[PDB]
């Protein structure tokens, strides 16, 4: 029905400048005003701003104006937003929403969302992940099972896929979120296995970076 | 512009529970507040609207009330896909969202279990030399790590990533790194992370030596 698609993960410079789309479709695109919200890594929600397809009107969060720019094209049902000299607080998810026009009663609200438009503003540049794998040592056993890592450092952009052993080994996993090192993201991820299955049964680190077509297979070695 | 807070940063409750979200204006906003659910996948959805209102679709579980400048949301009982992150809207005056309180569900204490990895010979002809510390499964969210090198406690190098609550066994992990230059962990014998947790006054020692 109310469709919000909306463009997809969006990478820039510091300084420079980015244009994202929201295509609404399953409604009259200029009887609703478009609102865009703004979402930084474990953040709230803040309000940017929401333009009126129909006449044109917009209307701006002070904070956003001057780095947020809102527009539309009727013919193409589709909102845009524009902001200006990224920096690093600019790395966030945005949302575009609806907002009906008024027509009296008291359903107003925010009732379609888009999936959200990714956006990172980094320096680096595509950069291929280095796989270490870390073996146990004396005292890494906790009951009747021992638990094994994989390292992956220094990659960029963001995402990575990381299984166990091609996927095959699911369970007793721990894959953490990754986090910044010198511009680059290192990420970890364990795994825990019956004692008696390891070194026995080798397990094997995967990591698969689509940024670099990168693949790296590190098995765990004692 | 009006301020919206939520008291609430985070909740936790067991399913079946009543749980009752705050929310707070920084002048009277007449009723136009409006509730919202975000799910861990980053999903957004309408629950109530017009202060009291439950929209369609939305289970009659989630209520809201309130007046003035001070509102709340209502589970009459909760359900595991509830657990989430909800915010409040304001629309008197232009919109502004509140700051949010997240869910999380009960579950038995739980002592983290942990285990400590040197750097892998791979990283050290890089030069690099990074330790690793996973504090796995572990109950409540609150842990505290320290790390020590022959003894001494260093705080520069370490990098630390925390999972959210697991969707199964409602635990939480940790992993911490200490990355040093290849040269720095060649001058040192022994590595040890600490975890301090409620489930005991002692912390939980993982140490080794070259």
């Known amino acids: 029905a109310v469709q919000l698609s909306q463009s997809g993960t969006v990478l820039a410079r510091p300084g420079a400048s980015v244009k994202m789309s929201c295509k609404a479709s399953g409604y009259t695109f200029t009887s609703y005003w478009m609102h865009w919200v703004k979402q930084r890594p474990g953040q709230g929600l803040e309000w940017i701003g929401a333009i009126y397809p129909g006449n044109s009107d917009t209307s701006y969060n002070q904070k956003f104006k001057g780095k947020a720019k809102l527009t539309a094209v009727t013919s193409a049902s589709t909102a845009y937003m524009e902001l200006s000299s990224l920096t690093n607080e600019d790395s966030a998810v945005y949302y575009c929403?609806?907002?009906?026009?008024?027509?009296?009663?008291?359903?107003?609200?925010?009732?379609?969302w888009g999936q959200g438009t990714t956006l990172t503003v980094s320096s680096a540049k595509t950069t291929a992940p280095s796989v270490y794998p870390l073996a146990p040592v004396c005292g890494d056993t906790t009951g009747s099972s021992v638990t094994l890592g994989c390292l992956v450092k220094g990659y960029f952009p963001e995402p990575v896929t990381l299984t166990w052993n091609s996927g095959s080994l699911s369970s007793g996993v721990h894959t953490f979120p990754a986090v910044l090192q010198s511009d680059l993201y290192t990420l970890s991820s364990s795994v825990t296995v019956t004692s008696s299955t390891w070194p026995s049964q080798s397990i094997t680190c995967n990591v698969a970076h689509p940024a670099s077509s990168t693949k790296v297979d590190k098995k765990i070695e004692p | 512009d009006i301020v919206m807070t939520q008291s609430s940063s985070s909740l936790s409750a067991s399913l079946g529970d009543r749980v009752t979200i705050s929310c707070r204006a920084s002048?009277?906003?007449?009723?136009?507040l409006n509730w919202y659910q975000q799910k861990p996948d980053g999903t957004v959805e309408l629950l109530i609207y017009?202060?009291?209102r439950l929209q369609s679709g939305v289970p009659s579980r989630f209520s809201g009330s309130g007046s003035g400048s001070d509102y709340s949301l209502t589970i009459s009982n909760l359900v595991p896909e509830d657990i989430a992150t909800y915010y409040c809207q304001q629309y008197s005056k232009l919109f502004t969202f509140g700051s949010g309180t997240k869910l999380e569900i009960k579950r038995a204490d739980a002592a983290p279990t942990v285990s400590i990895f040197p750097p892998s010979s791979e990283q050290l002809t890089s030069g690099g030399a990074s330790v690793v510390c996973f504090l796995n499964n572990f109950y409540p969210k609150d842990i505290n790590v320290k790390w020590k090198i022959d003894g001494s406690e260093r705080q520069n190098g370490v990098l630390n990533s925390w999972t959210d609550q697991d969707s199964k066994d409602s635990t939480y992990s940790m992993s911490s790194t200490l990355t040093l230059t290849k040269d720095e962990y060649e001058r040192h014998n022994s590595y040890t992370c600490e975890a301090t947790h409620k489930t005991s006054t002692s912390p939980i020692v993982k140490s080794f030596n070259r």
């Open positions: 002048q009277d906003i007449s009723n136009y």
């Open positions: 017009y202060t009291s």
């Open positions: 929403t609806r907002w009906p026009h008024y027509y009296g009663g008291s359903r107003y609200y925010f009732d379609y």
